[PDB]
């Protein structure tokens, strides 16, 4: 199991442009287009993103295009972010995908704001911090897929995944 794989299972693929949990559009694997309630914006983004006319859908190869710089984009983000860099930097290849995860869905800002689980990960005390993580929106809001990162960032294994 790698970074790609594990996104690909909480994500889902969409080759039509569709709206996420939070109603916003989206299209890929979890590629947000915008957070703007016309989809008219959201066409427009799209054919941006991708260079063409797309009217609103997309191949599998330009999804996987897309997918490509957005995980690409998530390592430079938290490498390049000093709140985070040492939490990565602290942890184990699993874990690290974990951590990835988060920031792929939530963004570096929002990940950065969860100060103390970020501190109880550096400080290895996985039980802390799972239980830390599990009282945020985040979870409440998502529960399946958070409580599989979770489980990711407690156990260091796959184990949530691979059910799935």
């Known amino acids: 199991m790698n970074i790609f794989e594990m996104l690909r299972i909480d994500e889902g693929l969409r080759l039509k442009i569709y709206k996420d949990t939070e109603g916003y559009y989206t299209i890929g694997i979890g590629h947000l287009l915008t957070k703007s309630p016309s989809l008219n914006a959201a066409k427009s983004e799209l054919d ?3 260079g063409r006319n797309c009217n609103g859908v997309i191949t599998k190869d330009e999804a996987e295009k897309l997918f490509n710089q957005d995980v690409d984009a998530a390592v430079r983000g938290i490498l390049r972010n000093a709140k985070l860099k040492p939490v ?17 869905q939530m963004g570096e800002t929002g990940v950065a704001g969860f100060t103390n689980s970020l501190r109880m990960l550096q400080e290895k005390r996985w039980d802390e911090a799972a239980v830390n993580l599990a009282k945020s929106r985040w979870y409440n809001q998502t529960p399946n897929r958070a409580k599989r990162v979770i489980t990711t960032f407690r156990t260091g294994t796959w184990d949530a995944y691979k059910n799935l």
Do not use: E, G, P, T
Not at 88 to 104: E, G, H, T
């Open 88 to 104: 990565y930097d602290s942890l184990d290849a699993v874990r690290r995908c974990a951590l990835i995860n988060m920031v792929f």
């Open 48 to 50: 941006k993103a991708i």
